[PDB]
């Protein structure tokens, strides 16, 4: 089997992407944030504290003839950005782009933090990291990908995120028309439960490539590119007036600037992030100070190849017995 679904930016900055997901019988379609940095499929629901729901579409398990309470199971998650959610668990039928999994754990939120409430466009998350990170207790549950894998034509999914435009998540096949050149594959460590890999270096603009190993995660659920302070300083030093602002929480730059590109290495191959992808607009409405899309990972504890990086590529998440990651230009 295969599936193919369009993923759409939630706003004009590509802060996140939502993909429609069918849950239950009859289908209830929710727009979920596909997140290769976590492993829980959780939704706003009829059980979510009413004051914490503000415009989201909810899953109502009592209206699904295929929903079953997973007795005794609870979940609770905290994300790198400080947001969180928790609740109980149903199993139900879940379909993405024509690909159907029966018996998928659907984690129903009883509580969500303010960041989720305040974002009306995201009805929940669909985790695509390794199932070892799933938070369901006392019986850990599998991700949608893990459940689908054996049925897929090939045990892969691909992320093709757009810049200020829709893109695609495919399951079970590689669309050879969706990228240019060849796909370069690189080793993955699953030791921390992430799609963790090592970039071979970077360049800033038309500058020379610096060969250096950068361990990090491919994370569709993180907006920005978080890299070591040395790398980030070298990037922003090429933008007149750019500075790290402790009050804003990262590098800012004059909105009048033209940003240089940023290149990262995948083996001997190179992915080029155009400068415009690195512009996240005014820090507050009407400001002429703009927020940078490349930020320091210092104090996160891990480097993160988030949407800023991934949207410059066609990315293969290969879930073969030994997982690997593939990147192509597009």
């Amino acid at each position: 089997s295969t599936g193919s679904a369009t993923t759409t930016p939630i706003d004009s900055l590509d802060d996140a992407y939502i993909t429609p997901v069918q849950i239950g019988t009859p289908a209830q379609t929710l727009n979920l944030d596909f997140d290769t940095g976590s492993s829980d499929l959780w939704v706003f629901s009829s059980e979510t504290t009413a004051s914490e729901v503000d415009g989201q579409t909810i899953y109502t398990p009592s209206k699904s003839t295929t929903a079953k309470l997973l007795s005794g199971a609870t979940w609770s998650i905290s994300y790198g950005d400080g947001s969180s959610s928790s609740g109980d668990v149903y199993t139900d039928t879940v379909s993405v782009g024509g690909l159907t999994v029966t018996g998928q754990a659907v984690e129903s939120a009883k509580k969500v933090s303010s960041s989720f409430t305040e974002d009306s466009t995201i009805d929940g998350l669909l985790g695509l990291a390794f199932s070892t990170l799933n938070t369901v207790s006392p019986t850990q549950q599998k991700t949608f990908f893990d459940n689908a894998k054996a049925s897929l034509d090939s045990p892969v999914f691909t992320a093709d995120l757009g810049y200020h435009a829709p893109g695609t998540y495919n399951f079970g096949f590689i669309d050879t028309t969706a990228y240019t050149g060849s796909i370069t594959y690189t080793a993955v460590s699953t030791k921390q439960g992430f799609w963790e890999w090592t970039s071979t270096g970077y360049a800033v603009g038309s500058g020379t490539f610096k060969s250096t190993s950068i361990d990090g995660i491919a994370d569709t659920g993180t907006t920005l590119l978080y890299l070591p302070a040395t790398v980030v300083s070298a990037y922003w030093a090429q933008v007149s007036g750019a500075k790290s602002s402790s009050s804003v929480g990262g590098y800012v730059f004059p909105c009048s600037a033209t940003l240089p590109s940023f290149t990262f290495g995948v083996g001997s191959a190179r992915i080029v992030i155009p400068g415009d992808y690195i512009d996240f607009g005014p820090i507050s409405t009407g400001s002429s100070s703009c927020f940078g899309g490349i930020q320091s990972s210092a104090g996160i504890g891990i480097n993160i190849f988030g949407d800023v990086a991934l949207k410059a590529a066609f990315v293969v998440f290969n879930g073969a017995t030994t997982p690997t990651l593939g990147f192509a230009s597009k």
Side-chain angles (χ1 to χ4, degrees), residues 200-242 244-262:
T200 48
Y202 69 98
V204 175
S206 61
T208 62
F209 188 83
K210 176 74 170 178
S211 294
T212 185
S213 295
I214 306 168
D215 294 342
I217 66 170
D219 185 1
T220 58
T222 291
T223 312
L224 307 185
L225 174 53
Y226 294 89
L227 292 174
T230 49
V231 177
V232 175
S233 183
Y235 178 80
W236 290 108
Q238 298 304 311
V239 179
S240 295
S244 182
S245 169
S246 56
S247 59
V248 177
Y251 280 89
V252 298
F253 68 94
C255 292
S256 61
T258 299
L259 297 177
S261 63
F262 183 89

Side-chain angles (χ1 to χ4, degrees), residues 7-19 31 33 115 118-122 161-167 222-224 277 279-282 307-308 311:
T7 193
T8 301
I10 64 163
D11 63 25
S12 66
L13 297 176
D14 297 346
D15 281 317
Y17 297 77
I18 50 173
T19 309
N31 296 327
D33 184 350
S115 179
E118 291 161 1
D119 184 6
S120 64
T121 71
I122 291 177
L161 301 180
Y163 169 64
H164 294 351
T222 291
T223 312
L224 307 185
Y277 289 26
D279 176 14
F280 279 75
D307 298 335
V308 163
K311 77 179 86 167

Side-chain angles (χ1 to χ4, degrees), residues 45-62 64-67 69-109 112-141 143-148 150-190 192-242 244-290:
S45 76
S46 54
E47 303 179 325
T48 310
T49 302
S51 61
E52 294 179 354
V53 185
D54 190 2
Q56 296 80 9
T57 295
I58 63 166
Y59 169 59
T60 304
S62 67
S64 174
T65 58
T66 42
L69 180 71
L70 185 63
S71 181
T74 60
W75 62 280
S76 181
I77 192 162
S78 301
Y79 297 102
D81 67 352
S83 69
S84 63
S85 52
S86 60
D88 54 17
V89 188
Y90 293 82
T91 56
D92 209 340
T93 301
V94 172
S95 300
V96 175
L99 169 66
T100 299
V101 167
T102 59
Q104 175 64 45
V106 177
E107 302 173 34
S108 167
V112 303
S113 64
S114 60
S115 179
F116 289 113
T117 300
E118 291 161 1
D119 184 6
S120 64
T121 71
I122 291 177
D123 302 325
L125 268 63
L126 190 149
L128 292 169
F130 292 88
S131 294
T132 52
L133 294 180
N134 176 265
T135 76
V136 178
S137 176
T139 308
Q140 187 170 63
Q141 300 294 304
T143 69
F144 174 80
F145 179 52
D146 220 330
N147 281 324
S151 305
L152 293 178
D153 289 359
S154 179
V156 304
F157 68 91
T158 64
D160 180 9
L161 301 180
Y163 169 64
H164 294 351
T168 306
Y169 282 101
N170 291 328
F171 292 82
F173 72 105
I174 287 158
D175 177 359
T176 62
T177 72
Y179 58 86
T180 62
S182 55
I183 305 177
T184 296
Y185 290 86
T186 195
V188 164
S189 172
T190 64
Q192 297 191 82
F194 300 122
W195 293 91
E196 186 169 5
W197 64 290
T198 302
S199 172
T200 48
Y202 69 98
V204 175
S206 61
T208 62
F209 188 83
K210 176 74 170 178
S211 294
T212 185
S213 295
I214 306 168
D215 294 342
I217 66 170
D219 185 1
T220 58
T222 291
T223 312
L224 307 185
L225 174 53
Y226 294 89
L227 292 174
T230 49
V231 177
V232 175
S233 183
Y235 178 80
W236 290 108
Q238 298 304 311
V239 179
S240 295
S244 182
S245 169
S246 56
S247 59
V248 177
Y251 280 89
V252 298
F253 68 94
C255 292
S256 61
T258 299
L259 297 177
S261 63
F262 183 89
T263 300
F264 65 92
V266 183
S268 53
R270 306 288 180 253
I271 299 295
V272 180
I273 306 171
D276 292 342
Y277 289 26
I278 298 161
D279 176 14
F280 279 75
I283 59 172
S284 291
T285 303
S287 178
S288 72
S289 180
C290 274

